[PDB]
Design a protein around this ligand. Structure first.
Ligand SMILES: CNC(=O)O[C@H]1COc2ccc(N3CCN(C4COC4)CC3)cc2[C@@H]1NC(=O)c1ccc(F)cc1
Length: 219
């Protein structure tokens, strides 16, 4: 039995919404948001982690291309290999590709492992969001309805299961009969419901939300 609804924001495991600007660093934002939750669960401290560190440092060896896109899984692998990631404060986001400037003097978190969930399985995603923490996922965001979303449960009949934008599932629920995933985006507070979008849940892997989910853990 899983809870009927989950909201990790209420358990203090979610940092302020970030603003990626012109740079396709959604994957980095998704990755740090997932690790921020684990850091809080382990240490009690909620600390924004450096998306810029990932953009600049988890690069070709990780199949990542900074502002041109990347993968949350290989971002986790970089944090494992690197033995750390800097705080956002120390290594701020600039919405552009820079030289790697990782400095262990400002290490704010580590990662020991990550787990990838099976393709399209919204049940397995629900279990992880309930039992483990916020989960990094991709979605198909290439529709004007997504960009223009303001409120309620988002459903786009033209959506596909092929992902192109990284976001973070921080919960799930039901809004007057419409089941949803509660998603933290990185398009600032101006987007959606103060930075969040509620996306259709149990609607055949809508927009690919359960196509490629993953989450990190800290030893
Ligand atoms: C800017 N958008 C952005 O980064 O979106 C992220 C969102 O998260 C995910 C999650 C899963 C996947 N999968 C793709 C398919 N792959 C299967 C295995 O064999 C094919 C599994 C992993 C892709 C992505 C996206 N990455 C890119 O599209 C991307 C774009 C340019 C790059 F250089 C690198 C990456």
């Amino acid at each position: 039995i899983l809870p009927d609804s989950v909201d990790w924001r209420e358990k203090g495991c979610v940092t302020e919404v970030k603003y990626q600007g012109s740079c396709g660093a959604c994957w980095a934002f998704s990755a740090v948001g997932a690790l921020e939750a684990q850091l809080k669960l382990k240490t009690g401290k909620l600390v924004s982690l450096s998306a810029q560190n990932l953009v600049d440092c988890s690069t070709e060896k990780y199949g990542n291309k900074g502002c041109n896109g990347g993968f949350m899984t290989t971002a986790f692998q970089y944090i494992i290999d690197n033995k750390g990631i800097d705080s956002d404060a120390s290594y701020p986001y600039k919405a552009m590709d820079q030289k790697c400037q990782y400095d262990s003097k400002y290490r704010a978190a580590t990662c020991s492992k990550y787990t990838e969930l099976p393709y399209g399985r919204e049940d397995v995603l629900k279990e992880a969001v309930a039992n483990k923490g916020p989960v990094s996922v991709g979605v198909d965001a290439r529709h004007p309805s997504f960009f223009l979303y303001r409120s309620g449960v988002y459903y786009e009949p033209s959506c596909t299961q092929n992902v192109n934008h990284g976001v973070l599932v921080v919960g799930y629920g039901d809004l007057n009969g419409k089941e949803y995933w509660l998603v933290k985006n990185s398009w600032g507070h101006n987007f959606g419901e103060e930075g969040y979008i509620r996306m259709a849940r149990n609607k055949g892997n809508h927009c690919g939300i359960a196509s490629f989910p993953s989450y990190p853990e800290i030893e």
